[model samples]
Target: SETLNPSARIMTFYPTMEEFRNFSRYIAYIESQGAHRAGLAKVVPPKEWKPRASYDDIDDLVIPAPIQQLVTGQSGLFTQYNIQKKAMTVREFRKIANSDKYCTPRYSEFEELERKYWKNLTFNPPIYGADVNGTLYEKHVDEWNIGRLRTILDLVEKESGITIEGVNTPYLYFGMWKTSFAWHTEDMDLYSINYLHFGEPKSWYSVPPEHGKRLERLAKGFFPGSAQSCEAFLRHKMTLISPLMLKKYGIPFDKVTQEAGEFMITFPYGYHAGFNHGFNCAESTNFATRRWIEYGKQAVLCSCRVKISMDVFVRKFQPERYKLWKAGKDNTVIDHTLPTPEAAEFL
Candidate 1:
């Protein structure tokens, strides 16, 4: 039971409005504190900072809710697998969450219930990718706005006229009791920033990238069937292993208790998982920096097939050349202008 308490702790920052305004510089400060080693950071912005979006206005919105069934894996490890997806409105979800038939049990309580009645347990489905384009996206404050972040993806889009939803565009999440996300990294191992708009806190667990391989080995041993089917089994987002199990297996990880008005940033290849404490609204999106180029290359190489155009794009516009140009090196003349056809090919 003691193993349930993680020894590692995630770094938390409280930034003034002025400091928070410069997103890139503040994030660099976070990395300077060695926060990246934990693979996650908790950021609490100025108290005056609040989005214009209100939860009351989005009650009728319909979203895809994923259903998960609890399963017992090897060594009494409890995990979950996706069963199906059902369309539901935010109002309908709130009706069930408020009903006495469903209770918001803590992780410890859930474990006890799993031992006694795992078969009959029903999980509250998480409402994922509820479009925020016209609502939250338009209402976000400029300084902390995820969509407008000065990330590599944004630069790529500006240069190539390519827009990637869920990478550059934001997705809203409606979470309730026991509605959870499984362990996984962002697509192409890019960084991700999640903001809890309102409602109850969300619990997050993460493993540093350095120990990601050990975690994978353990997962493969536990979910051999899933691993056999896909080389990147965790990408399925079906398995949920407890931090206690990870601790017992000697894997290093950290925890973050993210409250409303706070941000949780996940580093590249930092495997993370968590569940909501109760009904809550959160927005998240993937982002990339110059450093992410190498990781992206590695991720692409590991996949079944490589995109020749993407490889060429990376080579043509190497981050190092961009760095040199930023340094004001006279000989470093990196061209941002690319032919429309060539830019389209990069996709």
Candidate 2:
């Protein structure tokens, strides 16, 4: 597959009830894994309620007038929604959002309270967009099965036990107009899959691995001062690029406006960033295919080039393997039970 074009690809599908049912059957597993929920701009329930077919139906729900002003950027209420972020349980989040300190209009108080408040009392329970990596299984083990190719992340994870930096948890993004992620890549040049569950659209742009350096060069040319580290541009600290500008410079790139139920597949080392068109939720995660092993090797080699200390990484996995090797040192000659610690890290 490495011989094929390395650009990111998009796939859209409308599944039969049976097909969709296979995936949702694992809803029971969410509780077991303690799935992560995202905090988002609050969704105000209608005063006059009617039953909806499903959560997806809520995508087109109208915003309450008072909040509509903030959503549309008309009330200049951006500061009120800018809250200090943290992982919160659904119950804890609901309590604070319903509290007197957080309820009502008070944009002027943001500077004083800092992290204790929200920009507009707009918050969602962790269930809005959920992240569940631990629940993934191989061979659809027992009654809980995951289709191999359904999601590239699970596909690769099913085949390989290793993950980049030992952190392969999926990130489910639940966002509003201004909630956005800047340019970045998956850990250690791995690939990713983003599937829109249901909601408004997301606008995505990407640069191929070959042109990623050029993309950074262009970024530095535009944002010389704070664009010193990759984190600078990735954390929304640098100027955002337009596709038009990339085209004018002859950079190979592409764009996608992902809709409900669509999927986006990003290739290894691709640089991508995007924002939601409106209120929306999507699930995303990263993994590496067989071809990605080489890239992983290259990443560690590059990291070693700068002579960055490798002690922290070396310590993380040594205790178990080192002990096993010592216990198995049998015969007149000692044959170590393990290979090399550095070798395993790259693998």
Candidate 3:
């Protein structure tokens, strides 16, 4: 009660050496089970990124197989590339830490590009990939939890009076990567962690009520359950909602941007993109944040985050297995008893 008082509704835990090891055990167990069941969702390479060749209206079709591989398998995203390499891999993609390519865009370059991309958008998407920082999405996810956590805590408070802080494991708010990185929000049960990790010339101005007329005006058909669709929708959110919407329930982007121009955008659980920052350097990133929370005494909660590569980010669990970490009466994993070798790599 003394450590957690008013203005302190939630708590956070950055594990130490011992604690990290303890959590790792639980993670290994979870991964073992997951691997035993699905083997893995399987990687979706670059060749698969674009609409099928059949869907293309253009006479010529260009697909980046190398880049797709970088996004799909851990084996590639963090590894090799050559001058001849056309697509990227997970090994290669994870190294985007303020390299010449990432920082090359100067303010003038930004303005010049924005003039054509946003104001004019002559080139359409204008950019190949988009990254959403973490902090922003975390806040939104936290707010969204308000309605539900409150109900749970309300009862807990009546019984124990020791209010339980809001909770969610692996609340990831990734750095700027790409709007296309994720295909869609993980699921209704999963929360999004988004924020620009590195603060540089590329920082995005945010907007709110980001839904109205501004999004609608973008002029692209909305593809439900798609990051591209949402981006298309947001491009003209102001126009879609109406005029001077600040008076009503304005969107967050409106506040972030104040005016229209370029702002960092991230969609939780939605599709995103990646980059090849280094072959030797494990991109510490301009910023990197994983999800976590702390509760109970020695009753550590394990929210396992295994970044196998750009294509797959697996969440390994502990002793029990349940989808999305939620305990529904009907919710259960057949392999739920305990950890197994199939779940993880012993190394």
For every model shown, what is its TM-score relative to the native structure? Answer: 0.78, 0.46, 0.25
Residue 40 lDDT in candidate 3? 14
Over 74-148, each residue of candidate 3 has an lDDT whose tens digit, in order, gives 211111111223543323333342344332233354344333222221111112221111121223332212122
Across 1-347, the per-residue lDDT of candidate 2 in tens digits comes to 21123222222333333333443222212211211011000111122321123453233322111121111121211111222344544334334434554332333432322222223223431112223232222333322121233433343334544443223554445554434455666555555556565556666766656566677777666656545544334333123455556766666665556776555655555677655544565656554443343343334222211111222232333344444434654223211122212233222
lDDT of 1: 0.66
Most accurate candidate by lDDT: 1
Superior by TM-score: candidate 1 or candidate 2: 1
* Root-mean-square deviation of candidate 3: 19.7
In the predicted model 2, the residue pairs found to clash are: 37-126, 42-122, 42-123, 80-119, 80-120, 81-119, 81-120, 82-119, 140-145
lDDT of each candidate versus the true structure: 0.66, 0.40, 0.23
**Between prediction 1 and prediction 2, which has the larger lDDT?**
1
Write candidate 1's Cα lDDT for 1-347 as tens digits: 22233223578999998889987767766765666667788999898877665567878876665454444455435566556557777788777665665546544644453333323223334333333442364544688788678765665566667667677678887776666677887777778999988887788888877678788999899878777777786776667777668868888887667899899998777789877767788888887655565566555223331121234336456745554544545253211111112123223
- Give candidate 3's TM-score: 0.25
By TM-score, the best candidate is 1
Model 1 segments more than 4 A misplaced: 1-8, 64-79, 106-140, 300-313, 316-347
lDDT of 3 at 154: 34
**Cα deviation in Å at residue 202, candidate 3?**
6.4
Model 1 is weakest, by summed lDDT over 10 consecutive residues, at: 333-342
